[PDB]
Design a protein around this motif. Structure first.
Motif, PDB file in Angstrom:
ATOM      1  N   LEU A  13       0.852  -1.199   0.000  1.00 60.43           N
ATOM      2  CA  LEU A  13       0.000   0.000   0.000  1.00 60.43           C
ATOM      3  C   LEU A  13       0.891   1.255   0.000  1.00 60.43           C
ATOM      4  N   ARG A  14       1.907   1.284   0.867  1.00 55.67           N
ATOM      5  CA  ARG A  14       2.802   2.443   0.913  1.00 55.67           C
ATOM      6  C   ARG A  14       3.574   2.578  -0.408  1.00 55.67           C
ATOM      7  N   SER A  15       4.057   1.467  -0.964  1.00 53.73           N
ATOM      8  CA  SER A  15       4.767   1.520  -2.249  1.00 53.73           C
ATOM      9  C   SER A  15       3.806   2.042  -3.310  1.00 53.73           C
ATOM     10  N   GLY A  16       2.561   1.555  -3.270  1.00 50.28           N
ATOM     11  CA  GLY A  16       1.583   1.990  -4.253  1.00 50.28           C
ATOM     12  C   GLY A  16       1.270   3.477  -4.153  1.00 50.28           C
ATOM     13  N   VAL A  17       1.149   3.996  -2.934  1.00 51.74           N
ATOM     14  CA  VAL A  17       0.849   5.424  -2.824  1.00 51.74           C
ATOM     15  C   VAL A  17       2.035   6.271  -3.326  1.00 51.74           C
ATOM     16  N   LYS A  19       4.225   5.542  -5.659  1.00 52.04           N
ATOM     17  CA  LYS A  19       4.305   5.484  -7.104  1.00 52.04           C
ATOM     18  C   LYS A  19       3.087   5.991  -7.863  1.00 52.04           C
ATOM     19  N   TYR A  20       1.899   5.598  -7.408  1.00 53.31           N
ATOM     20  CA  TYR A  20       0.665   5.957  -8.105  1.00 53.31           C
ATOM     21  C   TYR A  20      -0.125   7.105  -7.507  1.00 53.31           C
ATOM     22  N   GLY A  21       0.194   7.471  -6.273  1.00 56.79           N
ATOM     23  CA  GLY A  21      -0.478   8.593  -5.639  1.00 56.79           C
ATOM     24  C   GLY A  21      -1.607   8.259  -4.686  1.00 56.79           C
ATOM     25  N   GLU A  22      -1.747   9.071  -3.646  1.00 56.16           N
ATOM     26  CA  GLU A  22      -2.817   8.878  -2.658  1.00 56.16           C
ATOM     27  C   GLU A  22      -4.161   9.067  -3.376  1.00 56.16           C
ATOM     28  N   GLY A  23      -5.165   8.241  -3.061  1.00 59.38           N
ATOM     29  CA  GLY A  23      -6.445   8.364  -3.747  1.00 59.38           C
ATOM     30  C   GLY A  23      -6.623   7.435  -4.948  1.00 59.38           C
ATOM     31  N   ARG A  45      -7.594   1.471   4.969  1.00 59.73           N
ATOM     32  CA  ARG A  45      -6.354   1.165   5.665  1.00 59.73           C
ATOM     33  C   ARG A  45      -5.457   2.404   5.654  1.00 59.73           C
ATOM     34  N   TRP A  46      -5.467   3.144   4.550  1.00 61.68           N
ATOM     35  CA  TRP A  46      -4.644   4.348   4.471  1.00 61.68           C
ATOM     36  C   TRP A  46      -5.080   5.311   5.583  1.00 61.68           C
ATOM     37  N   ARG A  47      -6.387   5.482   5.750  1.00 61.62           N
ATOM     38  CA  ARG A  47      -6.879   6.366   6.806  1.00 61.62           C
ATOM     39  C   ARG A  47      -6.428   5.864   8.180  1.00 61.62           C
ATOM     40  N   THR A  48      -6.509   4.563   8.402  1.00 64.44           N
ATOM     41  CA  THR A  48      -6.096   4.022   9.679  1.00 64.44           C
ATOM     42  C   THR A  48      -4.590   4.251   9.919  1.00 64.44           C
ATOM     43  N   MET A  49      -3.779   4.098   8.873  1.00 59.17           N
ATOM     44  CA  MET A  49      -2.337   4.287   9.024  1.00 59.17           C
ATOM     45  C   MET A  49      -2.059   5.711   9.488  1.00 59.17           C
TER      46      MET A  49
END
Lengths: 52, 52
Positions: A13-17, A19-23, A45-49
């Motif tokens: 998820l962190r790698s994805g954000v 590279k591809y951006g939040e949202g 999960r992003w919100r929880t992090m």
DNA sequence: CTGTTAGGGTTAGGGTTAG
DNA sequence: TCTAACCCTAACCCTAACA
């Protein structure tokens, strides 16, 4: 069944954000392995992090 | 303080689960009378009822 | 109809008391 | 000592408003 988020999913998820951006949850879901997650679950999960 | 469950509350809870389904605690709480309870309390009572 | 995301609302389930 | 009743809160759902 309710599944806690594992370390590897969190990493992806962190790698994805980065590279591809939040949202852009749907795009992130298509590029990394997650344990039967939907794009809404990634968003949540992003919100929880942030909270943690 | 603590509040044990009366037979009336249990009746409503069971009627509620039949009509709305298990897990739809907030909808149940909205359609039947309960002794100042929250949706979470209904969910916990159901668990105990199953455990008895 | 299939699918998307932001954000508020709700539930699952292990842990914590009250009595 | 035992346990039903209650708490914490991540995980999950519903809905709006579109494409």
């Amino acid at each position: 069944k309710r599944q806690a988020w594992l370390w590897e999913e969190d990493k992806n998820l962190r790698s994805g954000v980065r590279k591809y951006g939040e949202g852009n949850w749907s795009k992130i879901l298509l590029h990394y392995k997650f344990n039967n997650r939907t794009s809404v679950m990634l968003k949540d999960r992003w919100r929880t992090m942030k909270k943690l």
